[PDB]
Design a protein around this nucleic acid. Sequence first.
RNA 1: UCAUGCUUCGCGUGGAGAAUGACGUAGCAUGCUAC
RNA 2: GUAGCAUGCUACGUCAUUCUCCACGCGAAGCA
Lengths: 926, 73, 186, 190
Amino acid sequence: AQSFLNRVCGVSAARLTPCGTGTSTDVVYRAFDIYNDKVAGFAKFLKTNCCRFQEKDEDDNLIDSYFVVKRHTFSNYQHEETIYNLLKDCPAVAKHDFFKFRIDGDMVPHISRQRLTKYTMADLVYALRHFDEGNCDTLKEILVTYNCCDDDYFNKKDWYDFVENPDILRVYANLGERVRQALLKTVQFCDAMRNAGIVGVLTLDNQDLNGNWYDFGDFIQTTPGSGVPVVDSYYSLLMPILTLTRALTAESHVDTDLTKPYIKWDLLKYDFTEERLKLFDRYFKYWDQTYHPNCVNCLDDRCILHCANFNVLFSTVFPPTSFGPLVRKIFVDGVPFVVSTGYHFRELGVVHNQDVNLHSSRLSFKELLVYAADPAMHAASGNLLLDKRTTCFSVAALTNNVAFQTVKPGNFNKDFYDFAVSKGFFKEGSSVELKHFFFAQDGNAAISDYDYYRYNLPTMCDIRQLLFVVEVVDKYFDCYDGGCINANQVIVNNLDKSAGFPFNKWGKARLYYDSMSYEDQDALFAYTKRNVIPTITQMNLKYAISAKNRARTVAGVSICSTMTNRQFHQKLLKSIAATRGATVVIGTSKFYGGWHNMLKTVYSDVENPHLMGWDYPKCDRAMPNMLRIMASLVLARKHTTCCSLSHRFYRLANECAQVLSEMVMCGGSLYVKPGGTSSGDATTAYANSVFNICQAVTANVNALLSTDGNKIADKYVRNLQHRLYECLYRNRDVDTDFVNEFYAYLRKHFSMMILSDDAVVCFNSTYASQGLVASIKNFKSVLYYQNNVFMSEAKCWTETDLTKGPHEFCSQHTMLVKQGDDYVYLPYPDPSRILGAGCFVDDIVKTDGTLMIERFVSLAIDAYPLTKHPNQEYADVFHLYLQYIRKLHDELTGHMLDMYSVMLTNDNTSRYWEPEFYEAMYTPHT
Amino acid sequence: SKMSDVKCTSVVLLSVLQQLRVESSSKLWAQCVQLHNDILLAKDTTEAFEKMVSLLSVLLSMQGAVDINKLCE
Amino acid sequence: FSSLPSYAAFATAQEAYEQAVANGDSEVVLKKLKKSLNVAKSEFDRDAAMQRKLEKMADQAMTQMYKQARSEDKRAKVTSAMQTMLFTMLRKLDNDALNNIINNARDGCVPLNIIPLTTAAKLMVVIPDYNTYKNTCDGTTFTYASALWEIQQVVDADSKIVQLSEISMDNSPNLAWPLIVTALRA
Amino acid sequence: FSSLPSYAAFATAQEAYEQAVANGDSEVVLKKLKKSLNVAKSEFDRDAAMQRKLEKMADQAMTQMYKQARSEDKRAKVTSAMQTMLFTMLRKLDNDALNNIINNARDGCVPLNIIPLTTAAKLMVVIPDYNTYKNTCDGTTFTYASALWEIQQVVDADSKIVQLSEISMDNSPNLAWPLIVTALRANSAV
RNA sequence: UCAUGCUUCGCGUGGAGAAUGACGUAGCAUGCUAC
RNA sequence: GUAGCAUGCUACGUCAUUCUCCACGCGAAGCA
Ligand SMILES: O=c1ccn([C@@H]2O[C@H](COP(=O)(O)OP(=O)(O)OP(=O)(O)O)[C@@H](O)[C@H]2O)c(=O)[nH]1
Ligand SMILES: [Mg+2]
Ligand SMILES: [Zn+2]
Ligand SMILES: [Zn+2]
């Protein structure tokens, strides 16, 4: 055994100790990107073939440099020697050493690999993509070994969390250069194996954490100069780590090194097409698919996604003052305006308005709307701003004073509280207590709730899997119909809603909907199909009763964007809200048996049903831009017959311009929105459902691919996994025959019910146990690496007894009751919610009960189900509401007869304090 | 019923302060808002009362705004 | 529904029909009496519908007026009602600190700053007269808000420092009230 | 109403029926007069219903033409008040620096985010805490956006003048943060 | 300042439809009167 | 047999309610 170590050390200054067991293989769990003829997937296999020897340097100081020696067959050992001789000149290849050492009876060959780190790139990618806080030992060891953080950094309260301590981002960023170096070396290696004419597949698990490549098993030697590397799985699996780690952060320094100052980019420069092409050919040289820096030239949706997944990465290198509406000086009747004639999207590149008419004569109402909506004149004429409260880029201040907006405490309904106390409520130890109040805020409420956008980081999605999850999601949305509709057919519920900024200075949305004819609305919509209209979106401040200190802000998008978005999306959105039995349960009421029908639909025919559910922490503020563009692109899949590719791209550009990178107006000042949904655009509730389904399908894909594959007894799921890997990382066109099969698999074993960021899943517990469908850990991992969000256990829930129903969906708990001599699921609220709605009100007028008895009728309608709750306080809540409605009716009659001597006692008002009027709301007849 | 009672009293007390134009002073209004929000979220009643004392002292600091001798009487 | 001439005609027709049915008179007479009774009943029903519409409209108008008046009242005297409610609730709590500071503030011993919560905090309380001074201040310690405070300073009414010894039974008229006692929580 | 053109026939038939009902008229022929009255009443009632429907349609058409008038009035008001905003902020655009930056552009297009960063003649800095003040705005003249700004006025959250001597580490707690300092570009970006 | 959607309750006006009742006009079967 | 009145069926017009659906206005409530 000593002689074996002496021979492994070779002709070198190697002072190394053994890690195995005295000339024997070492067992180790390592992540492998494996695709044989029998197995496929990016799982974590236990492969025991090598004999690691760890090198000692500096007089017994142990370091990470392992001489990985393996025993070979002497048939592929000859092959692996004639492939290394060709590639041994490259600097990106770990130095091997081939030697036949007499062990037992013959000279079995050995292939020593010199000075490899402990982990490979596949281990890093698996540790970050499949992240579980209970067994994240490899990630911690990688972080400690490369001086990212001290070993005691992990004794912190939830160090991994992206919200509790953002500093973890910094800790990841210290791997950046490392990763970047690897990328460079990959390119070198590719060039080498092209100069020598070597055809092979590059996988992550054959590249230590220094970039060096060390496996040449499946490399076939072709004619010199025409060897093709295969780098689909390599680059694709590595993509989410390039932005999480901020690898290209060294591209912002002169001569590309972190020891030199930042390159002083020219301010007037907005076209970075050549820089993007240089970066692509620098790091992703041997990526086969063609890359369009400006997605104006992209072919279809599957090309826009592919070529924007690169722009999200390359736009982190360029200055943030270059991304925004390109501004050009136009003359109208001789008076020179300054209007926006383009845009520079961080994702979609440079977009130039097609029909820009400088030197016009008169401004029509449509043109006045367009010129007064965009922030060109507003930001150009305003005075510079440097707001240190936030981190978001601030453009300009529209006024000479900052506007501070507070939140009022909320009024107290002392009559109802006194009544409830007289009825025995609000005692010490009572199971029903006040938890929902109107929280007051200081003068920085809006700016703080807006600065919560700091959670939106640039995320580079794994494109090869995103392009498949998109097809499966589109399959989920294939039972509807959509298209463009005329201005005649657009339905606007309430026209007394604000028209955003600056249009709220002159009226409500009614003024701008009735003051321009259908011809003007059609003209504006047809204009947006070949032009980009940036808009300012006021950041309002919602005023509502809640149990959290969170003064929610919502985006007051302009009327210019809302009208066009309605015309574009209204048919599809109204079709999604009129379909019963789909996964998206938007538009389904919970009354008259709707809740029971929804639940019995979710359960369907899942064979070993367990329920699970989640709720994204900050769905709108944490959503990455790629998933929002994807949602907009699959909502536009219904326009295959009315809009051409150019029209669809310019509609996507308009959406990205006014609801993804808008210039918000948070209190008399213009800021730049980092990204994520603007909750308040014409498709907020329906673009969250697409994102929810995308996350669920991604979790299922990762759960099925990370499974071993050799341990799957079911010979159908094994072939499903093999074909799934082929369809992700070995095909470039969509195979509908397998998208249908995977969709059927998900429907059979993974039933969803989606509504914005709220999902309830009934899944096959046996498969989820074996690793063939998404558990909750898989969903947490996907959220970690694709949302920059760690979803704690407060947002997640699971239920192993489906007869109890979902634990919580849309803030409504479910309970199985005996309704009409039948068993049905009824939704009941949180009693604290109903009681706090009764006690505290918005307006001072609402504190007089007799004025508003319909408040309490509606609250009793919502609180009726509590009548059947086994807890008695919960039924007392409903009885209290009925008794208070009766008291209000008596007092109103008394006051009316006392002031106007006219008896007012109708027989139709006695049904609001009788339970039957409320039982009728949950019986499935109407 | 002494905790939900201080919660409601704090709500009404901050309303009374707000209608006395205490928002015109950003510092004092921030202090009042913090005290009110902490009272609403308080679990133990001792700290809730010791935090209500501060809010009531804010109300009592301004002697011209509220006539204690008449409201109490 | 009486009080209508149409209902009077309807009642007369009904009485005539009920008296004639026992008579068993000519069929033609019975049928034409039935027709006239039906015409009168139709007129009465039309008038009843009109009266129902008028009553419903009047009740709607009355409810609208009542709601307007009560909303105006509720939005008008908000300032007085809120303070009355607040002090009713503070009386109801019956605490040891709230009652103490309210009773002190009735006599004019209000604070100058927010009453603190931490030991290393400063309280500045205006003491308007020697009676309240003896009530609260004893020795070198101050009893305000059900806690003991260390009197660190006593500023005269003219900003002049005053020693705790100079405030005596007979120096009270001499000194310039109100004083400002600056103390620390203990 | 009683102004309908055919109301005269109904009135005459009613008068004839009333005359035949009493005063010693025929019993079997009076039924003929009653039938004539009935047909006249039916005709008059149908005519009255049609006339009432026409009157209500005319009233409706008088609520749609007035509504259009108000819609056009509001359209004119908003048009004037919306192109009077554009001209106001069009005069506030300092043509010297704006033209300087525009004409240096490759093809006239420049990003919007630099229009205030290179041409604005006034800067507003909002400072949450004193450490930020010391780091960024300390002194009377500071440097930002590669330009030199001389402080013109400092106000607090209450919008009350705060002297530069009142912003100190010891006096920080007595200020109503954030402080809003409105600097003025010095010598046009020196 | 208070956005985009969905759902429910209350009241009012308009239109359509159905049910019972009332009056009238028209068509078919029998009885009575003027000729 | 023409015309008128009585009894029995079908068609049309006008009113009196009851209910169903929708179109809108107004007030209110919950949910993402
Ligand atoms: O009033 C609302 C609430 C919600 N939403 C839309 O629904 C999303 C989710 O709204 P939620 O109420 O679920 O909250 P949240 O997930 O944003 O945050 P947490 O309470 O979990 O901390 C929002 O981000 C927005 O897209 C609205 O548009 N309006
Ligand atoms: Mg949420
Ligand atoms: Zn492309
Ligand atoms: Zn279309």
